[PDB]
Amino acid sequence: KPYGCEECGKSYRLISLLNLHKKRHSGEARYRCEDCGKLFTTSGNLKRHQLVHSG
Numbered sequence: 001k002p003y004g005c006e007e008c009g010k011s012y013r014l015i016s017l018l019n020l021h022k023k024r025h026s027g028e029a030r031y032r033c034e035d036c037g038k039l040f041t042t043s044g045n046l047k048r049h050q051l052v053h054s055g
């Protein structure tokens, strides 16, 4: 199933593929939003984004 970037709209074959695509945009992919699966290199950037799901 085409796994595409919600952000830029490129579909990948694998999740890890798109995961590395998502990693590519931020350099590296550390944390993810435990809800929507957005990768943040900063847990605080993440946190603020986590708080929009529970804020």
Ligand SMILES: [Zn+2]
Pocket: 005, 007, 008, 009, 010, 021, 022, 025
């Ligand atoms: Zn992207």
Ligand SMILES: [Zn+2]
Pocket: 033, 035, 036, 037, 038, 049, 050, 053
């Ligand atoms: Zn999120």
